[PDB]
Symmetry: D2
């Protein structure tokens, strides 16, 4: 239908979560261009700071409506508004650390609202996360498809570590629309790149940016 | 002057969210720490009736209730009266993943458990959302130290109607709250857990568990 | 190089999946610098295969990837002495495959000795029941772990009725000669296709196109 | 008139490759199936000496030698004179991934095993390639039926030099050569395996394993 999505969107996000027995609340004002698949956010930890973990593991939980979609790819995400949609996500890191995240997404005019939740367990004390040895998320490629009838995305992720070592994480998100009638898209790919643009010593304030582009792979891309 | 007594009470509240259905469950239990045997009556206070298999939360309803033999260090009875806390991951073969955690404390003859539980990515047509589970099969927990921390891994299996099984890998880390508590060597904990009875919609459940720690073959 | 812009390809695989043994020969031709290669495969032994042919197909040389100038090309750098890989394919339903290929080049031809071993596919899975359609296009991630080039992939077989069958690959790349320069983190896009086949895939014509890039926001 | 005797011989030859290194290990030993014990002296005919920890081949060297109680259907002993076969995947925590196979048959009082074994992606600096393993810890195989086939999953751990552990998940699929043989229901199989003896190079090795099957708690 007609979406309600206009090319400059405000972004309003709200995260509550616990890693390793440590609670934190974080807020973010942000703005974006859904149709260019770009956005940036100003996160500010409202409780639980300084976080004793790496802020990087939180970042992808900070909306694939901001994915530049070609018209030969069904945009399950933009066609899900006004009503909106919600995702669930597991992150499984290679040292048995595992997070689950939920984000539920609505729209009040020029603004997306995100009630996000984040939980992480089993991070080992001398690992990259708890010792905060992380540098950035490398550029990834999300594999999009339908299983048991739900748009699913899997990703093979890797965090750059000091020493230019890499820390592997597997990602699986399930997206569900709030409204009936949303066409399921054929299998596709979504390149992204996420980025901490600026940040203070303790990470209590953070500038985040993301660029996500959908494509069919080779070749034709 | 022991912190652990032969007949103990168990007081628990869990709060969780699986597939986005919120819930709070409360349990009122009794145990025999030295016999590794305990039972519990749980009543759902919010979220009833639960739209997923009650079974998935049951191991998240305390290893002080294991019978430990003298030749295996008993970390959990050693962690009291101050307490301890576990974090747990449950990874289901169909994408089902839960994380959970329990902070156990003690007042006199009573354990106080604050428990959380979050489950994502269970399919609509799987054994959990369809409520086809009957019971956790009796299982063996592998206990070992990794990075300063007591850790158990378990190959779990949920028995289903039609008698197929449905697999879960669990990892649990246990952390004493007081310093200095001595880490056990490598060992095994035998478990069996059961819903003795329940009301139709699982708003009231009586749970029972039994765990016995051992060293395996060939000394058992 | 001495890797020519038009290479020929000599393949020879020997395999065993679910205790079914097979031997498969393939000869083809390539445009290494364009990142493209097709091959005519023939099952010399153990056919008609009791399982989906697609699972063997990535087992049928990253040297055929278009590498841009800002990315180290480990694979063409490894020649003319060559390189090797072991790979593991972990499928969602417990089915596991491992593969190895030694890749040598004498003259204008690449030679591959390729091994491939599969265990624990369920009797009624998409693999033993032949319900696979094609691999979907993919995107290998290349990084270094413990001084060895590694490429991990989120793979997915398209099946009958458009369902998918997930698979996770890990591949480790080892240059033959010492101290060949390890590349920085990067991606290869892939697309592999059976172009045509006969009834029981005793005869198979394959194509693959790989392009290396450093991801957004550049690619 | 039962096929299996209380004192069998074992003839086993293995062919294998880990990390591009080929090898052949031949074997000769004995054991008591109804007791669930066996032992064998293993000779490296080729590939020797072996770069990698010898322990990772050890479980790949027959559940016939498992002690089953009358209340559990013994799939393996009900497989013979015809015999049975297994496939194995070993998935190590640091990316190392093994797959193995064996066809077990019988000729008189001898079991004959054709063992294949292939490990890939073991990190040059790991305990595997660096040979810092000491032993497998005692374990418990979880036996159940998937798609009509006997499948046992294990939570394995290697003890390494320095009191650390190395984790490995096992999945084995068991298939009789004979039609009809009836599958048991869920059970546990306690294992313990031991290099009893070996030369500095590990080209000659004496092995011992002990298997006992049971219903787990509280029926053990």
């Amino acid at each position: 239908h007609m979406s309600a999505i206009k090319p400059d969107m405000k972004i309003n996000l709200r995260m509550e979560g616990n890693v390793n027995g440590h609670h934190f609340v974080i807020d973010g004002d942000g703005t974006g261009k859904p149709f260019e698949g770009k956005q940036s956010m100003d996160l500010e930890v409202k409780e639980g700071g300084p976080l004793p973990f790496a802020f990087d593991i939180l970042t992808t939980a900070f909306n694939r409506v901001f994915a530049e979609y070609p018209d030969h790819i069904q945009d399950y995400f933009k066609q899900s508004f006004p009503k909106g949609y919600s995702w669930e996500r597991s992150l499984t890191f290679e040292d048995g650390g595992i997070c689950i995240a939920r984000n539920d997404i609505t729209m009040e005019g020029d603004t997306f609202y995100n009630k996000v939740r984040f939980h992480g367990v089993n991070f080992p004390a001398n690992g990259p996360v708890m010792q905060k040895k992380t540098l950035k998320w490398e550029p990834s490629t999300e594999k999009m498809y339908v299983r048991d009838g739900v748009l699913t995305g899997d990703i093979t992720m890797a965090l750059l570590l000091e020493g230019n070592a890499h820390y592997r994480c597997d990602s699986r998100t399930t997206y569900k629309a709030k409204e009936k009638g949303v066409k399921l898209p054929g299998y596709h790919l979504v390149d992204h790149c996420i980025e901490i643009l600026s940040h203070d010593k303790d990470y209590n304030k953070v500038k985040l940016y993301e660029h996500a582009v959908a494509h069919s792979g080779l070749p034709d891309n």
